[PDB]
Amino acid sequence: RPRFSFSIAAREGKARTGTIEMKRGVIRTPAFMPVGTAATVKALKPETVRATGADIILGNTYHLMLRPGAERIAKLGGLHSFMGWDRPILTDSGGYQVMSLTKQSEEGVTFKSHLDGSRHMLSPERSIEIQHLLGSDIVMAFDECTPYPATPSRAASSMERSMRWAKRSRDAFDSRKEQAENAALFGIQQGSVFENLRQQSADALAEIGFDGYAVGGLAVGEGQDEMFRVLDFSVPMLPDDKPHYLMGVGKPDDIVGAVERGIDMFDCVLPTRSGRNGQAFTWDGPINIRNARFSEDLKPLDSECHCAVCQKWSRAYIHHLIRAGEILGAMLMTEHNIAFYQQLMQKIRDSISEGRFSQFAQDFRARYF
Amino acid sequence: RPRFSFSIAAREGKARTGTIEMKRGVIRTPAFMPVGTAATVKALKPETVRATGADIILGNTYHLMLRPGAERIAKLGGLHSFMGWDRPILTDSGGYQVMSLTKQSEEGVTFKSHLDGSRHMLSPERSIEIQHLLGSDIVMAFDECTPYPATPSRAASSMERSMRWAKRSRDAFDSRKEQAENAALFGIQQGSVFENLRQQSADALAEIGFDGYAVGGLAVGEGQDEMFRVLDFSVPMLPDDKPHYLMGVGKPDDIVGAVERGIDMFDCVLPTRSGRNGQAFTWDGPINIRNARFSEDLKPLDSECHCAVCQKWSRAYIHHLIRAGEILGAMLMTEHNIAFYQQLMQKIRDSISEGRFSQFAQDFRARYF
Ligand SMILES: CN(C)CCSCc1cc(N)cc2c(=O)[nH]c(N)nc12
Ligand SMILES: CN(C)CCSCc1cc(N)cc2c(=O)[nH]c(N)nc12
Ligand SMILES: [Zn+2]
Ligand SMILES: [Zn+2]
């Protein structure tokens, strides 16, 4: 296959469905990327992740540069070989999380490990290098976190810095032969909720040129209405012939709405994180399996779900497992949830290909809520 | 198949290898039974347990009578259906653990739940009933725990009580039509380390008549030498044409030695428990994967092991996972360890069938240590 090739097969309104061809495999869009925090999709073997339908996973950079270490993973053969996943892997730049889980300057960010307190410097150049050492297929540009709420000037400065960092990410990426020829680079749009800033960011990104464009700075507490409002005018600013990636957005209803507004890629820990809290997704809305009303419920988590969990075990059993704090509980809940998400993406892709996505969205919401 | 049929195909010294035919399947002996504490073999799907080679698992009665509840499991269709394991399941009587994890009388034992402090009474009659409600294939007689060390009189009294309880277990079991016709009953020998008491217990048990005989009261802190000493004269006291079950014994070297002394069945949490502590079994002895020397070791846990874990992941990866406290770490370590144990039982069975077990034991110990 080629290094990177995105083609759109069908459209409906702002929605698109197509594929991204990469050396390690094909990615069907809109796509949902399970998240791999510590070089592992929480409680699942790679084969199980793949069995649910995932074509690509997100590698958690922040934790990996610390715990095992980028250099160590490279010595060991790279992330794909290390964890046993031979398909595409997208890695975030790490900077954002650092400014969450610090001394920030125009050159990067200095911080102390949340594990052993060690000091570390992370710059656009170092982020690209780390993602290269990890063997990432889709590399994210190193950007700066914009607090929410954010004033116009504060949002502008941070966005302007991110654009300067984007150019540096681009060059660092292109200066590394092996990486520029086998991996792809995604730029990240910033600008908070301000249209003029989003437009400036988009033009700067397009001027630099990337393989994909992400809408960053959202899902930071602005509520769905505001997020959708921002997506309405933000996504159209991005090049139409390249993938549109909404970072950190995963609630089913968020995904459906984001796709209606032109988003092609998603990632969220919610599926796996909710795979211990007791939250299981169903087409009739989410349920907390720990609730007493499920103690003797013999039905599967979801009446229609096709995943292996819904074929073999009952809510009553999973209920017991979660309340007993058993590992198998997390395993089954996580497999189901991730399978549910992939099934959601499949229905979205099919409905768009068949020109009935808008109706699907309406039917989905009516029942889900 | 029949309700219960044990036949010996080969022998060598006191060692035997054969099969136990039961309605839900065949059990190859000597056999190792993975332990299922809360209606789940820790961190493994039933299919994975079976894939490692296990023909039967041990259902943890104590925890089940409390957490989900015997009556509830029966209402839900029984343990096999509940957890997704359709093969034989052996259940302990619960009494022993109660006197561990209390008011004791000739009628049974009164205790407070280690979960919510609730009060509960457990008698021979109630234990048999609970195992019936769980749908157990091999039911253990309700016996009394004999402290260690134990004086002759204290050991005699407790043993005499256990024998009275064994008769009651037998009758309660036979009075329940469905259970007596589809399940088997195992009596448990007691008597601490005293030969005369072990002989009395054995004669009483044989007088009552059971489908199998367990050597209880061992592995309570007496050390391997003493345990083996007790097994030397204890096992021969048991009927030769019925299975000999050593409860709570699982270290590889213990198993090999016990088989040389006539034991056909084993169970131990060590395999799974050591599947979080970082202990992985190898033919060169156990290793603690958390040790720094494994951080960049690309070799599998064991150079010869045939399990799926050793085919796909490295020590370095499992090392990272365990130190990061990831669930997958426990999953992989547990699958390997249980697979290692089943491989051990296979080698023992084959070596006996081929009349070279004694040599295998010698070769095993030389390398393992
Ligand atoms: C723990 N995860 C849920 C979050 C990991 S960081 C992923 C992430 C999430 C969100 N909401 C916005 C952004 C953004 O604007 N830039 C970058 N680089 N990453 C982001
Ligand atoms: C937690 N497990 C390791 C132990 C569960 S109790 C199993 C168990 C273990 C041992 N060592 C001896 C005996 C015994 O003499 N009688 C009974 N009924 N059970 C026993
Ligand atoms: Zn499901
Ligand atoms: Zn192995």
UniProtKB/Swiss-Prot annotation, chains A, B:
Catalysed reactions, semicolon-separated: 7-aminomethyl-7-carbaguanine + guanosine(34) in tRNA = 7-aminomethyl-7-carbaguanosine(34) in tRNA + guanine
Result when mutating D267N: Abolishes catalytic activity
GO cellular component: cytosol
Function, in words: Catalyzes the base-exchange of a guanine (G) residue with the queuine precursor 7-aminomethyl-7-deazaguanine (PreQ1) at position 34 (anticodon wobble position) in tRNAs with GU(N) anticodons (tRNA-Asp, -Asn, -His and -Tyr). Catalysis occurs through a double-displacement mechanism. The nucleophile active site attacks the C1' of nucleotide 34 to detach the guanine base from the RNA, forming a covalent enzyme-RNA intermediate. The proton acceptor active site deprotonates the incoming PreQ1, allowing a nucleophilic attack on the C1' of the ribose to form the product.
InterPro entries reported for this sequence: ArchSynthase1/Queuine_TRR, TGT, TGT-like_sf, tRNA_ribo_trans-like
Pathway: tRNA modification; tRNA-queuosine biosynthesis
Note on how the cofactor is bound: Binds 1 zinc ion per subunit.
Binding site for substrate: D92, S93, G94, G95, Y96, D143, Q190, G217
Protein name: Queuine tRNA-ribosyltransferase
Gene: tgt
EC number per UniProt: 2.4.2.29
Top-level taxonomic group: Bacteria
Family, as annotated: Belongs to the queuine tRNA-ribosyltransferase family.
Effect of S93A: Strongly reduces activity
Binding site for Zn(2+): C305, C307, C310, H336
Keywords assigned: Glycosyltransferase, Metal-binding, Queuosine biosynthesis, Transferase, tRNA processing, Zinc
BP-aspect Gene Ontology terms: queuosine biosynthetic process; tRNA wobble guanine modification; tRNA-guanine transglycosylation
Pfam families in the cross-refs: TGT
Start and end residues of each stretch annotated as RNA binding: 248-254, 272-276
Gene3D superfamilies attached to this UniProt entry: Queuine tRNA-ribosyltransferase-like
Cofactor(s) needed: Zn(2+)
Subunit composition and interactions: Homodimer. Within each dimer, one monomer is responsible for RNA recognition and catalysis, while the other monomer binds to the replacement base PreQ1.
Species of provenance: Zymomonas mobilis subsp. mobilis (strain ATCC 31821 / ZM4 / CP4)
Active site residues of this protein: D92 (proton acceptor), D267 (nucleophile)
